[PDB]
Amino acid sequence: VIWMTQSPSSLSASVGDRVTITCQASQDIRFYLNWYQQKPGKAPKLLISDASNMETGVPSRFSGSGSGTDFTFTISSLQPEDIATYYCQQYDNLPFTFGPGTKV
Amino acid sequence: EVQLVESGGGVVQPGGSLRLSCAASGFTFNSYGMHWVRQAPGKGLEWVAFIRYDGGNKYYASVKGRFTISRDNSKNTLYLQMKSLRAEDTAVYYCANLKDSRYSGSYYDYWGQGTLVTVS
Amino acid sequence: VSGNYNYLYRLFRKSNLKPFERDISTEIYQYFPLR
């Protein structure tokens, strides 16, 4: 079992600010990390796959990078539509796990 | 359009059992593996179980020994049989097809709406 | 004489290996897996 953690657990930012979320794996996961965004009352939406690949339809303001145990998710410029809980998920091995979730 | 529809939720007593189902349409259900994920009020996303496309190999999370995952590819339906339910199992249960380059090979990410299960 | 620390082995893992399987993961064991 791989344990996942995220930091900060919650952050305060305004529109136009740069937002960064750190995901850390208790185990080396190379580039097998997914990033999800969840709005209240809705199922999670995938934004980034394989650590740094953007999903089709995802705004260019979203990005991410990293490998091994330390991964970063970034919003180059926070929009009013970007208020959600962000999760990282590893699929290097089973069982799959999600992080605690970061509140933006 | 691609849809995943959960049903079979409701309220049960501790020690009881409940069978959930997810009807799939709009995609080649029988070529993909499937996952169950649950989320309790106030908490994050918790992975529960995974089954391969052929209904052969099965994997489980906290639920191993109590929950069983199965599927019927002739009906495009995914099932989760939960026995010996506890208060801690209160959650919204989702069926999903998670993008996975290592095991299932899915190139697309799909989620249902979720069904609420209460144990009390 | 000072000790050769270049060679490492795995001490911790959540499961046993399958025939001719290789694992170079750094998973923390519920510990740093290599010594």
UniProtKB/Swiss-Prot annotation, chain C:
Disordered as annotated region, ranges: 11-32
Highest taxon above the source species: Viruses
Region of interest (Immunodominant HLA epitope recognized by the CD8+), residue spans: 4-12
Documented effect of changing residue 16 to K: In strain: Omicron/BA.2.75, Omicron/BQ.1.1, Omicron/XBB.1.5, Omicron/EG.5.1
Result after altering residue 32 to L: Increased resistance to neutralizing antibodies and human covalescent sera neutralization
Assembly, per entry: Binds to host ACE2. RBD also interacts with the N-linked glycan on 'Asn-90' of ACE2. Cleavage of S generates a polybasic C-terminal sequence on S1 that binds to host Neuropilin-1 (NRP1) and Neuropilin-2 (NRP2) receptors. Interacts with host integrin alpha-5/beta-1 (ITGA5:ITGB1) and with ACE2 in complex with integrin alpha-5/beta-1 (ITGA5:ITGB1). May interact via cytoplasmic c-terminus with M protein. May interact (via N-terminus) with host bilirubin and biliverdin, thereby preventing antibody binding to the SARS-CoV-2 spike NTD via an allosteric mechanism.
Function, as annotated: Attaches the virion to the cell membrane by interacting with host receptor, initiating the infection. The major receptor is host ACE2. When S2/S2' has been cleaved, binding to the receptor triggers direct fusion at the cell membrane. When S2/S2' has not been cleaved, binding to the receptor results in internalization of the virus by endocytosis using host TFRC and GRM2 and leading to fusion of the virion membrane with the host endosomal membrane. Alternatively, may use NRP1/NRP2 and integrin as entry receptors.
Descriptive protein name: Spike protein S1
Natural source organism: Severe acute respiratory syndrome coronavirus 2
Residues of the full protein shown: 445 to 493 of 1273
